[PDB]
RNA sequence: AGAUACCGUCGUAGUUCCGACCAUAAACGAUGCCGACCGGCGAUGCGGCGGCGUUAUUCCCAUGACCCGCCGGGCAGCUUCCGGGAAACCAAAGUCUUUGGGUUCCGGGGGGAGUAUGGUUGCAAAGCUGAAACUUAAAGGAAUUGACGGAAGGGCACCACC
RNA sequence: UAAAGUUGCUGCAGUUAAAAAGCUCGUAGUUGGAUCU
């Protein structure tokens, strides 16, 4: 079980600090790889130049052609 | 097969319960009584019911049956069940007891009984089935 | 090894109370245990108890009345100020009409209400209700 | 017309029992639905909580039945819950109503602080379990209201509780278990030994023993 | 018996117990049937304390008498050895007898033909009449049992430590219980022996019936 | 989902048990797990008994018996029908079948 | 139980088990309310007075109702002291 | 694919890489 | 059909011993250790204690072999509405919303992946530590009713056979 | 940020759903039986 001593504050805090890294969202927010890989770089919006128009096929079981743009 | 369906058996049992006095061991008299007392809209069904009533009456005459019980039969069984011997089987001039039983009686200040006779206990203590 | 004697005694008392027993044997004895039992008895939860005195640490036989729902211990013994008592009362007690938190203060071993009356803090030992 | 088939029903019909608390005192099981109608009467209101289709796989195909959850109460200290599964919805609802009013328990109400006026909250913290669902009821100050999910709130209101705090753990998406856990938690209020119930109990004549001569006649 | 001299056990009752063998138990002992035992002799047979048996019988009689309507007491026997004793007890006292098979749902299924609501239950063997015992827990029914050295005591309130194996012992126990109930009611007197002998409650054993039929 | 409490073998309070060889297929199987069968039979069959008793030079000469210890793995025991599958409640019963008449 | 004004505010007062002091609930169908008759010390007939005991179903399931009833009767003097 | 054979395939691929991806290179 | 397999004949490392490496297994009770409390029953192994009676040491104690009990550790078994749990089941997997005896390791939806890279150990095979980009709305546990089985046992039929 | 008792000190889990090191020793750390008015 967990240690319940009166002088175990360092152990508890260190263990929690180390086990927070096994949370997907905490590690994603605090590691920096996701921010580097994000094309917007953390911005809510961005401006671009339309390279072309494309059509993406909808995944099954739906059938359609979604109109998109490469920018 | 000649197994009787539950309709015939139920009707026969009810008829024997209600009219035990009027019935007997004759199939034809039984089938004449059945049409008198019961309403059977078929001749073959009446014959089957009468033929089962005769068999059941013979079985009753042989002895008690697991199913129906007649009021007269119940009253006669009461008389057979009030059988009483002239003397009590519990009355014995000598009753054999073990020394431990005598000690238990003595602890209840009943060690002065004259009917008691102390018997020698068994020398060997072997009362278990041999494991194997 | 055994490191808390009050915890073992309270666990034994609670287990015997759940089973409907009339008497409980708790060993080893301790004056902290005697104070806790006296505090419980003053409120009518257990009843009279007898200390059997062998030449090593003693034993206690406690009579039960069936009025005890839960008696427990808090480990470690946390320092409780007089302004933080209400939080422990909310966390540990079932209602505000009954139940007691047991504290060891500089005046002695008592309940939380008696410590409020005497205006003193201390260390929490356990609770019962 | 009502023709009782049990001794308790005959006693209730012949006006030998004053209140349902007499039956609750002796923990006598209730087997006839007409007793509750006789005592609680018009104060009872019911509400359908869920209609759930269940299916049994057969050789030709699935066979479907419908299960109704019905909660009932008089908003003045009594509450009951019933579950009934049938082929048709209406039959299941009628059966659920009957089964809910059959299993009606009283509710004990207490105070949070100063004991002034009528009781408004639960006497203490009470816990109920059903499946993986755990429900905890905590006393609340007057005027707080019921702080809970929609499903337990209906049962708490029908019981007559005005103020209460609620905690819940487990898969509460199972509506049946969620309702049964809080029903058990509510039922546990009269089973808790508080210090004000420490007085020795004075026994009284049981209705079976008290009215035996009248029962012999009928 | 609250130490009253009138309720004390007499010598003739002790002789009847010794003749019937009610003091002889089994080789196995139940851990909750140990306060009524006296001592285990050789061959593994346990001996029952007859004074405690008398005390339990008197307590059961007091419990039975307290019921106003005699028909509210049900006496049940499943084994053949106890059926005649139960029938005679019901005839002499006014209780309701159930001899033979007990139909499940008798106390719970209210739409059956044999549905009943007894106020007290008396059984001959907890291990053989377990079905009526289990249904007692559903309808708040106190139970009285004739237990042995090895017998479970779940749902049993008043246990009478007798020998429930032999026919003579069972018949004697039922006869004495009926006698005590009648004497407490104020029907027969304690000054003279009861008119009926305890052999009317014994099992017939149709082998004995055949032997007696050909006696003359 | 455990199927048996004893894991289908008789190993208690020890780590390893030496393996033996199946009589039928020569598979390696732990000794405690294997199905054992002790066969005591007659060398000569029923008809051979009467045929031989007349041709013997001795009087009331008792024919010798054959004693064999057979070990089977689970697959061979099931296939040879010396062991069969049972109901979930009947698996617990470990009394040998009533071969004694 | 009662408010500050002293008025009692409860639907009913449940009875407690005589053996274990536990509360017997409204849905406890294994509980027993048994009566034991009192006899006259001179004649031994039914006095008309009785003593009432109540046992909860938890004790009965434990098979401890026999001993509890025996002790209750001994305490009340119904059973002889030299039992 | 059985996990044992998948592990064996991964090990063989790693050995092939190690032979091709020489430390000298 | 095809066998580079299952089957059969041979047969190399190996299988055996000594000295150096390797440290991995469904290395499993898939269940960390220490301590307290909480129901019954019958066996079993070791030690000790008590007690009628059979046997051997030709006599005697005494000591071995049996028999009936008690105590303490140990491997287990049966039963129970002690209580738990999603259940299967568990006298521990209990004494948990009535949540705190001490302490170590360790998990955070499914894949990518125990992979890449760095470090370290090894002669090698490999061992230890150990990601991310990206992708996905489920994957999975226990139990229930059906349908199937080149699974077991019964039953019936001249649209089956004899 | 709460919802998240899905980072659990209050307050989570580790037989089968993710999980207890193959086993033992052992320093630091944590914890430690009664008794003195
Ligand atoms: Mg992902
Ligand atoms: Mg579509
Ligand atoms: Mg959900
Ligand atoms: Mg499987
Ligand atoms: Mg070992
Ligand atoms: Mg191994
Ligand atoms: Mg095997
Ligand atoms: Mg490993
Ligand atoms: Mg293993
Ligand atoms: Mg492992
Ligand atoms: Mg042992
Ligand atoms: Mg050993
Ligand atoms: Mg020994
Ligand atoms: Mg916890
Ligand atoms: Mg993951
Ligand atoms: Mg979709
Ligand atoms: Mg054909
Ligand atoms: Mg042909
Ligand atoms: Mg958040
Ligand atoms: Mg929160
Ligand atoms: Mg998350
Ligand atoms: Mg909390
Ligand atoms: Mg979790
Ligand atoms: Mg796993
Ligand atoms: Mg391990
Ligand atoms: Mg150290
Ligand atoms: Mg200290
Ligand atoms: Zn094989």
């Amino acid at each position: 079980g967990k240690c319940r001593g009166l002088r175990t504050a360092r152990k508890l805090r260190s263990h929690r600090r180390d086990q927070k890294w096994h949370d997907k969202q905490y590690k994603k927010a605090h590691l920096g790889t996701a921010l580097k890989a994000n094309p917007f770089g953390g911005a809510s919006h961005a401006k671009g130049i339309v390279l072309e128009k494309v059509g993406v096929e909808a995944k099954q079981p739906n059938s359609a052609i979604r109109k998109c743009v490469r920018v | 097969g000649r197994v009787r369906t539950k309709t015939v058996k139920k009707a026969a049992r009810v008829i024997i319960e209600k009219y035990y006095t009027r019935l007997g061991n004759d199939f034809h008299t039984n089938k004449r009584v059945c049409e008198e007392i019961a309403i059977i809209p078929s001749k073959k069904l009446r014959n089957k019911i009468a033929g089962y009533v005769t068999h059941l009456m013979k079985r009753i005459q042989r002895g008690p049956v697991r199913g129906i019980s007649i009021k007269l039969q119940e009253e006669e069984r009461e008389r057979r069940d009030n059988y009483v011997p002239e003397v009590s089987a519990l009355d014995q001039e000598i009753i054999e007891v073990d020394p431990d039983t005598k000690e238990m009686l003595k602890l209840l200040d009943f060690g002065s009984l004259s009917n008691l006779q102390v018997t020698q206990p068994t020398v060997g203590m072997n009362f278990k089935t041999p494991r194997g | 090894v055994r490191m808390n004697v009050l915890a073992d005694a309270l666990k034994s008392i609670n287990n015997a109370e759940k089973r409907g027993k009339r008497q409980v044997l708790i060993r080893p004895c301790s004056k902290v245990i005697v104070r806790f039992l006296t505090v419980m008895m003053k409120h009518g939860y257990i009843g009279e108890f007898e200390i059997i005195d062998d030449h090593r640490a003693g034993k206690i036989v406690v009579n039960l009345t069936g009025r005890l729902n839960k008696c427990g211990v808090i480990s470690p013994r946390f320092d409780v100020q007089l302004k933080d008592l209400e939080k422990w009362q909310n966390n540990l007690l079932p209602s505000r009409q009954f139940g007691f938190i047991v504290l060891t203060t500089s005046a002695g071993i008592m309940d939380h209400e008696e410590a409020r009356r005497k205006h003193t803090g201390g260390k929490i030992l356990g609770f019962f209700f | 017309e009502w023709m009782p088939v049990t001794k308790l029903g005959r006693l209730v019909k012949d006006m030998k029992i004053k209140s349902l608390e007499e039956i609750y005192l002796f923990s006598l099981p209730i087997k006839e639905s007409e007793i509750i109608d006789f005592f609680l009467g018009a104060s009872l209101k019911d509400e359908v909580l869920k209609i759930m289709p269940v299916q049994k796989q057969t050789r030709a195909g699935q066979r479907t039945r419908f299960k109704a959850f019905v909660a009932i109460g008089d908003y003045n200290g009594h509450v009951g819950l019933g579950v009934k599964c049938s082929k048709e919805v209406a039959t299941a609802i009628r059966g659920a109503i009957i089964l809910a009013k059959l299993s009606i328990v009283p509710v004990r109400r207490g105070y949070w602080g100063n004991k002034i006026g009528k009781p408004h909250t639960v006497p203490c913290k009470v816990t109920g379990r059903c499946g993986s669902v755990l429900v905890r009821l905590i006393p609340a100050p007057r005027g707080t209201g019921i702080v809970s999910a929609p499903v337990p709130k209906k049962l708490l209101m029908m019981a007559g509780i005005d103020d209460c705090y609620t905690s819940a753990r487990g898969c509460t998406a199972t509506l049946g278990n969620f309702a049964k856990a809080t029903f058990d938690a509510i039922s546990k209020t009269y089973s808790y030994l508080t210090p004000d119930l420490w007085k020795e109990t004075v026994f009284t004549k049981s209705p079976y023993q008290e009215f035996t001569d009248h029962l012999v006649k009928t | 018996s609250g130490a009253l001299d009138v309720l004390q056990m007499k010598e003739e009752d002790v002789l009847k117990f010794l003749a019937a063998g009610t003091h002889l138990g089994g080789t196995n002992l139940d851990f909750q049937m140990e306060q009524y035992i006296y001592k285990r002799k050789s061959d593994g047979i346990y001996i029952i304390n007859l004074k405690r048996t008398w005390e339990k019988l008197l307590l059961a009689a007091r419990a039975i008498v307290a019921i106003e309507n005699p028909a509210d007491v049900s006496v049940i026997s499943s084994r053949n050895t106890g059926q005649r004793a139960v029938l005679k007890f019901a005839a002499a006292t006014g209780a309701t007898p159930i001899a033979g098979r007990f139909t499940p749902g008798t106390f719970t299924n209210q739409i059956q033909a044999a549905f009943r609501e007894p106020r007290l239950l008396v059984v001959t063997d907890p291990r053989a009449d377990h079905q009526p015992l289990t249904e007692a827990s559903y309808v708040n029914l106190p139970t009285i049992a004739l237990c042995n050295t090895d017998s479970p005591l779940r749902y049993v309130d008043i246990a009478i430590p007798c020998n429930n194996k032999g026919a003579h012992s069972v018949g004697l126990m039922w006869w004495m219980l009926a006698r005590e109930v009648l004497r407490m009611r104020g029907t027969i007197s304690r000054e003279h022996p009861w008119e009926v002998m305890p052999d009317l409650y014994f099992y017939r054993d149709p082998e004995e019936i055949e032997k007696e039929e050909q006696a003359a | 989902t455990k199927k048996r409490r004893n894991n289908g073998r008789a190993k208690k309070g020890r780590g390893h048990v030496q393996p033996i060889r199946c009589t039928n297929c020569a598979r390696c199987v732990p000794k405690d797990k294997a199905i054992k069968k002790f066969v005591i039979r007659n060398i000569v069959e029923a008809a051979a008994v009467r045929d031989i008793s007349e041709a013997s030079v001795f009087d009331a000469y008792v024919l010798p018996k054959l004693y064999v210890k057979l070990h089977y793995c689970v697959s061979c025991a099931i296939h040879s029908k010396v062991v069969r599958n049972r109901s979930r409640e009947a698996r617990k019963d470990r009394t040998p079948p009533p071969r004694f008449r | 139980m009662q408010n500050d004004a002293g008025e009692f505010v409860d639907l009913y007062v449940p009875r407690k088990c005589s053996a274990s002091n536990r509360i017997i609930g409204a849905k406890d169908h294994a509980s027993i309310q048994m009566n034991v008759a009192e006899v006259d010390k001179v004649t031994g007939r039914f006095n008309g007075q009785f003593k009432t005991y109540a046992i909860c179903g938890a004790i009965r399931r434990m098979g401890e109702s026999d001993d509890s009833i025996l002790r209750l009767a001994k305490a009340d003097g119904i059973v002889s002291k030299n039992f | 694919m059985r996990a044992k054979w998948r592990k064996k395939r991964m090990r063989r691929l790693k050995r092939k890489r190690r032979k091709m991806r020489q430390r000298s290179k």
Side-chain angles (χ1 to χ4, degrees), chain B residues 74-91:
Chain B
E74 288 276 0
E75 193 167 3
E76 188 53 87
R77 287 191 66 185
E78 264 192 357
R79 304 174 184 180
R80 300 164 185 173
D81 199 17
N82 65 40
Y83 175 82
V84 163
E86 63 287 348
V87 304
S88 300
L90 300 175
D91 296 336

PDB file of all heavy atoms in Angstrom, chain B residues 74-91:
ATOM      1  N   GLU B  74     -60.377 -43.445   6.183  1.00  0.00           N
ATOM      2  CA  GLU B  74     -59.677 -42.637   7.178  1.00  0.00           C
ATOM      3  C   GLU B  74     -60.164 -42.949   8.588  1.00  0.00           C
ATOM      4  O   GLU B  74     -59.360 -43.089   9.520  1.00  0.00           O
ATOM      5  CB  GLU B  74     -59.861 -41.151   6.867  1.00  0.00           C
ATOM      6  CG  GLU B  74     -59.096 -40.659   5.649  1.00  0.00           C
ATOM      7  CD  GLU B  74     -57.660 -40.297   5.971  1.00  0.00           C
ATOM      8  OE1 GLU B  74     -57.263 -40.434   7.147  1.00  0.00           O
ATOM      9  OE2 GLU B  74     -56.930 -39.870   5.052  1.00  0.00           O
ATOM     10  N   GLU B  75     -61.482 -43.065   8.766  1.00  0.00           N
ATOM     11  CA  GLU B  75     -62.023 -43.364  10.086  1.00  0.00           C
ATOM     12  C   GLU B  75     -61.590 -44.746  10.561  1.00  0.00           C
ATOM     13  O   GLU B  75     -61.279 -44.932  11.744  1.00  0.00           O
ATOM     14  CB  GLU B  75     -63.546 -43.245  10.064  1.00  0.00           C
ATOM     15  CG  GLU B  75     -64.192 -43.217  11.436  1.00  0.00           C
ATOM     16  CD  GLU B  75     -65.645 -42.783  11.380  1.00  0.00           C
ATOM     17  OE1 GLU B  75     -66.158 -42.569  10.261  1.00  0.00           O
ATOM     18  OE2 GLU B  75     -66.271 -42.650  12.453  1.00  0.00           O
ATOM     19  N   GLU B  76     -61.563 -45.728   9.656  1.00  0.00           N
ATOM     20  CA  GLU B  76     -61.110 -47.064  10.033  1.00  0.00           C
ATOM     21  C   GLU B  76     -59.614 -47.077  10.330  1.00  0.00           C
ATOM     22  O   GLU B  76     -59.155 -47.818  11.207  1.00  0.00           O
ATOM     23  CB  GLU B  76     -61.453 -48.067   8.932  1.00  0.00           C
ATOM     24  CG  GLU B  76     -61.193 -49.521   9.302  1.00  0.00           C
ATOM     25  CD  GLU B  76     -61.853 -49.927  10.609  1.00  0.00           C
ATOM     26  OE1 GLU B  76     -63.034 -50.335  10.581  1.00  0.00           O
ATOM     27  OE2 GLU B  76     -61.193 -49.833  11.666  1.00  0.00           O
ATOM     28  N   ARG B  77     -58.836 -46.269   9.607  1.00  0.00           N
ATOM     29  CA  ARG B  77     -57.416 -46.154   9.907  1.00  0.00           C
ATOM     30  C   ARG B  77     -57.186 -45.513  11.264  1.00  0.00           C
ATOM     31  O   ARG B  77     -56.214 -45.843  11.946  1.00  0.00           O
ATOM     32  CB  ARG B  77     -56.699 -45.356   8.817  1.00  0.00           C
ATOM     33  CG  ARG B  77     -56.522 -46.104   7.508  1.00  0.00           C
ATOM     34  CD  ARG B  77     -55.574 -45.361   6.585  1.00  0.00           C
ATOM     35  NE  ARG B  77     -54.219 -45.315   7.126  1.00  0.00           N
ATOM     36  CZ  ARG B  77     -53.215 -44.641   6.574  1.00  0.00           C
ATOM     37  NH1 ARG B  77     -53.414 -43.948   5.461  1.00  0.00           N
ATOM     38  NH2 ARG B  77     -52.014 -44.658   7.136  1.00  0.00           N
ATOM     39  N   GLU B  78     -58.067 -44.602  11.680  1.00  0.00           N
ATOM     40  CA  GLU B  78     -57.980 -44.071  13.039  1.00  0.00           C
ATOM     41  C   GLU B  78     -58.152 -45.183  14.071  1.00  0.00           C
ATOM     42  O   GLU B  78     -57.408 -45.257  15.059  1.00  0.00           O
ATOM     43  CB  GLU B  78     -59.026 -42.978  13.250  1.00  0.00           C
ATOM     44  CG  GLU B  78     -58.508 -41.565  13.055  1.00  0.00           C
ATOM     45  CD  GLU B  78     -59.490 -40.520  13.543  1.00  0.00           C
ATOM     46  OE1 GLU B  78     -60.594 -40.903  13.983  1.00  0.00           O
ATOM     47  OE2 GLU B  78     -59.158 -39.318  13.492  1.00  0.00           O
ATOM     48  N   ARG B  79     -59.132 -46.063  13.852  1.00  0.00           N
ATOM     49  CA  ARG B  79     -59.356 -47.174  14.770  1.00  0.00           C
ATOM     50  C   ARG B  79     -58.177 -48.140  14.767  1.00  0.00           C
ATOM     51  O   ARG B  79     -57.798 -48.670  15.817  1.00  0.00           O
ATOM     52  CB  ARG B  79     -60.652 -47.896  14.406  1.00  0.00           C
ATOM     53  CG  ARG B  79     -61.863 -46.978  14.375  1.00  0.00           C
ATOM     54  CD  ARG B  79     -63.097 -47.696  13.863  1.00  0.00           C
ATOM     55  NE  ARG B  79     -64.235 -46.788  13.742  1.00  0.00           N
ATOM     56  CZ  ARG B  79     -65.440 -47.152  13.316  1.00  0.00           C
ATOM     57  NH1 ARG B  79     -65.669 -48.411  12.968  1.00  0.00           N
ATOM     58  NH2 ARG B  79     -66.416 -46.258  13.236  1.00  0.00           N
ATOM     59  N   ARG B  80     -57.597 -48.391  13.594  1.00  0.00           N
ATOM     60  CA  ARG B  80     -56.397 -49.220  13.526  1.00  0.00           C
ATOM     61  C   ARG B  80     -55.198 -48.527  14.161  1.00  0.00           C
ATOM     62  O   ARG B  80     -54.251 -49.195  14.590  1.00  0.00           O
ATOM     63  CB  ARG B  80     -56.094 -49.584  12.073  1.00  0.00           C
ATOM     64  CG  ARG B  80     -57.208 -50.357  11.383  1.00  0.00           C
ATOM     65  CD  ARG B  80     -57.043 -50.351   9.871  1.00  0.00           C
ATOM     66  NE  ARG B  80     -58.170 -50.993   9.203  1.00  0.00           N
ATOM     67  CZ  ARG B  80     -58.346 -51.013   7.886  1.00  0.00           C
ATOM     68  NH1 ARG B  80     -57.469 -50.422   7.086  1.00  0.00           N
ATOM     69  NH2 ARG B  80     -59.404 -51.622   7.367  1.00  0.00           N
ATOM     70  N   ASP B  81     -55.216 -47.198  14.222  1.00  0.00           N
ATOM     71  CA  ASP B  81     -54.115 -46.410  14.752  1.00  0.00           C
ATOM     72  C   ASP B  81     -54.247 -46.124  16.242  1.00  0.00           C
ATOM     73  O   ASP B  81     -53.297 -45.614  16.844  1.00  0.00           O
ATOM     74  CB  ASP B  81     -54.005 -45.091  13.983  1.00  0.00           C
ATOM     75  CG  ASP B  81     -52.650 -44.434  14.137  1.00  0.00           C
ATOM     76  OD1 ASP B  81     -51.698 -45.127  14.548  1.00  0.00           O
ATOM     77  OD2 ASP B  81     -52.538 -43.223  13.851  1.00  0.00           O
ATOM     78  N   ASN B  82     -55.390 -46.431  16.854  1.00  0.00           N
ATOM     79  CA  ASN B  82     -55.516 -46.320  18.300  1.00  0.00           C
ATOM     80  C   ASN B  82     -55.155 -47.619  19.012  1.00  0.00           C
ATOM     81  O   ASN B  82     -55.515 -47.796  20.180  1.00  0.00           O
ATOM     82  CB  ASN B  82     -56.926 -45.854  18.694  1.00  0.00           C
ATOM     83  CG  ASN B  82     -58.016 -46.852  18.334  1.00  0.00           C
ATOM     84  OD1 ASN B  82     -57.853 -48.065  18.472  1.00  0.00           O
ATOM     85  ND2 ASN B  82     -59.154 -46.333  17.891  1.00  0.00           N
ATOM     86  N   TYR B  83     -54.469 -48.530  18.323  1.00  0.00           N
ATOM     87  CA  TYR B  83     -54.036 -49.784  18.924  1.00  0.00           C
ATOM     88  C   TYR B  83     -53.180 -49.521  20.154  1.00  0.00           C
ATOM     89  O   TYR B  83     -52.250 -48.712  20.121  1.00  0.00           O
ATOM     90  CB  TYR B  83     -53.256 -50.609  17.898  1.00  0.00           C
ATOM     91  CG  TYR B  83     -52.652 -51.879  18.451  1.00  0.00           C
ATOM     92  CD1 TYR B  83     -53.415 -53.028  18.593  1.00  0.00           C
ATOM     93  CD2 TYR B  83     -51.315 -51.930  18.824  1.00  0.00           C
ATOM     94  CE1 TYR B  83     -52.865 -54.192  19.096  1.00  0.00           C
ATOM     95  CE2 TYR B  83     -50.758 -53.087  19.327  1.00  0.00           C
ATOM     96  CZ  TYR B  83     -51.535 -54.215  19.461  1.00  0.00           C
ATOM     97  OH  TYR B  83     -50.977 -55.367  19.964  1.00  0.00           O
ATOM     98  N   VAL B  84     -53.500 -50.218  21.245  1.00  0.00           N
ATOM     99  CA  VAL B  84     -52.858 -50.008  22.532  1.00  0.00           C
ATOM    100  C   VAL B  84     -52.517 -51.363  23.136  1.00  0.00           C
ATOM    101  O   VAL B  84     -53.400 -52.213  23.284  1.00  0.00           O
ATOM    102  CB  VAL B  84     -53.748 -49.203  23.496  1.00  0.00           C
ATOM    103  CG1 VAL B  84     -53.265 -49.357  24.922  1.00  0.00           C
ATOM    104  CG2 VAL B  84     -53.772 -47.736  23.098  1.00  0.00           C
ATOM    105  N   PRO B  85     -51.262 -51.623  23.493  1.00  0.00           N
ATOM    106  CA  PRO B  85     -50.928 -52.887  24.155  1.00  0.00           C
ATOM    107  C   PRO B  85     -51.425 -52.909  25.593  1.00  0.00           C
ATOM    108  O   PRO B  85     -51.717 -51.876  26.200  1.00  0.00           O
ATOM    109  CB  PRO B  85     -49.399 -52.925  24.095  1.00  0.00           C
ATOM    110  CG  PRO B  85     -49.003 -51.487  24.072  1.00  0.00           C
ATOM    111  CD  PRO B  85     -50.074 -50.776  23.287  1.00  0.00           C
ATOM    112  N   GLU B  86     -51.525 -54.123  26.136  1.00  0.00           N
ATOM    113  CA  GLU B  86     -51.971 -54.278  27.517  1.00  0.00           C
ATOM    114  C   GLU B  86     -50.951 -53.711  28.498  1.00  0.00           C
ATOM    115  O   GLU B  86     -51.324 -53.092  29.500  1.00  0.00           O
ATOM    116  CB  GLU B  86     -52.260 -55.753  27.818  1.00  0.00           C
ATOM    117  CG  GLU B  86     -51.059 -56.692  27.731  1.00  0.00           C
ATOM    118  CD  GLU B  86     -50.607 -56.960  26.306  1.00  0.00           C
ATOM    119  OE1 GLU B  86     -51.347 -56.602  25.364  1.00  0.00           O
ATOM    120  OE2 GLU B  86     -49.509 -57.526  26.127  1.00  0.00           O
ATOM    121  N   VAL B  87     -49.662 -53.902  28.224  1.00  0.00           N
ATOM    122  CA  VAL B  87     -48.598 -53.395  29.077  1.00  0.00           C
ATOM    123  C   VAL B  87     -47.731 -52.445  28.263  1.00  0.00           C
ATOM    124  O   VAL B  87     -47.684 -52.502  27.032  1.00  0.00           O
ATOM    125  CB  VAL B  87     -47.742 -54.528  29.684  1.00  0.00           C
ATOM    126  CG1 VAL B  87     -48.621 -55.509  30.439  1.00  0.00           C
ATOM    127  CG2 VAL B  87     -46.945 -55.237  28.600  1.00  0.00           C
ATOM    128  N   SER B  88     -47.048 -51.552  28.973  1.00  0.00           N
ATOM    129  CA  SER B  88     -46.144 -50.617  28.318  1.00  0.00           C
ATOM    130  C   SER B  88     -44.831 -51.303  27.969  1.00  0.00           C
ATOM    131  O   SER B  88     -44.251 -52.025  28.785  1.00  0.00           O
ATOM    132  CB  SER B  88     -45.878 -49.410  29.218  1.00  0.00           C
ATOM    133  OG  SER B  88     -47.075 -48.713  29.514  1.00  0.00           O
ATOM    134  N   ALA B  89     -44.358 -51.074  26.743  1.00  0.00           N
ATOM    135  CA  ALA B  89     -43.052 -51.585  26.352  1.00  0.00           C
ATOM    136  C   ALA B  89     -41.920 -50.866  27.074  1.00  0.00           C
ATOM    137  O   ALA B  89     -40.802 -51.389  27.129  1.00  0.00           O
ATOM    138  CB  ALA B  89     -42.869 -51.467  24.839  1.00  0.00           C
ATOM    139  N   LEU B  90     -42.188 -49.680  27.626  1.00  0.00           N
ATOM    140  CA  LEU B  90     -41.173 -48.972  28.397  1.00  0.00           C
ATOM    141  C   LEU B  90     -40.970 -49.601  29.769  1.00  0.00           C
ATOM    142  O   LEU B  90     -39.884 -49.486  30.347  1.00  0.00           O
ATOM    143  CB  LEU B  90     -41.556 -47.499  28.534  1.00  0.00           C
ATOM    144  CG  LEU B  90     -41.715 -46.724  27.223  1.00  0.00           C
ATOM    145  CD1 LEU B  90     -42.216 -45.314  27.486  1.00  0.00           C
ATOM    146  CD2 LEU B  90     -40.402 -46.692  26.460  1.00  0.00           C
ATOM    147  N   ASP B  91     -41.993 -50.264  30.305  1.00  0.00           N
ATOM    148  CA  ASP B  91     -41.871 -50.901  31.610  1.00  0.00           C
ATOM    149  C   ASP B  91     -40.909 -52.079  31.535  1.00  0.00           C
ATOM    150  O   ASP B  91     -41.161 -53.055  30.823  1.00  0.00           O
ATOM    151  CB  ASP B  91     -43.241 -51.365  32.103  1.00  0.00           C
ATOM    152  CG  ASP B  91     -44.196 -50.214  32.339  1.00  0.00           C
ATOM    153  OD1 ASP B  91     -43.718 -49.084  32.572  1.00  0.00           O
ATOM    154  OD2 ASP B  91     -45.424 -50.438  32.294  1.00  0.00           O
TER     155      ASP B  91
END
